């Protein structure tokens, strides 16, 4: 029971870093996983990485690169994005995952460019 | 981790 809006997309240039944020709105934020997925148009939608109260899972395509945290006391999961390549140009959107539930967020867009 | 459930169903998404 958890409403979900990602921010801190942007255009940025190749090599740079971007820091996404999904924040959380209503109760039990805890009990749920947070997973980190990106879409770009015309493509299908990929997994990047996830975190529970403490462990994370990346993708082997942004593992070295990409670091997802989590502060319970924001209420926010983060997703710190270095040495971005054009080809990580996307749409990211968060999901919250309790048990076999899953709710949603909006999507922010991020651009990178050389 | 009390959601280690969840994260190993995203680590089975990762095809």
């Known amino acids: 029971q958890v409403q979900l809006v990602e921010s801190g997309g942007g255009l940025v240039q190749t090599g740079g870093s971007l820091r996404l944020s999904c924040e959380a709105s209503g109760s039990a934020f805890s009990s749920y996983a947070v997973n980190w997925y990106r879409q770009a148009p015309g493509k299908q939608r990929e997994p990047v990485a996830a975190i529970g109260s403490f462990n994370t899972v990346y993708s082997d395509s942004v593992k070295g690169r990409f670091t997802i945290s989590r502060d319970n006391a924001k209420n926010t999961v983060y997703l710190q994005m270095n040495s971005l390549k054009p080809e990580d140009t996307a749409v990211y959107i968060c999901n919250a995952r309790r048990g076999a539930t899953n709710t949603w967020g909006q999507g922010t867009q991020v651009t990178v460019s050389s | ?15």
Do not use: A, I, R, V
């Open chain 2, 1 to 15: 981790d009390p959601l280690q459930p969840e994260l190993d169903s995203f680590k089975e998404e990762l095809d």
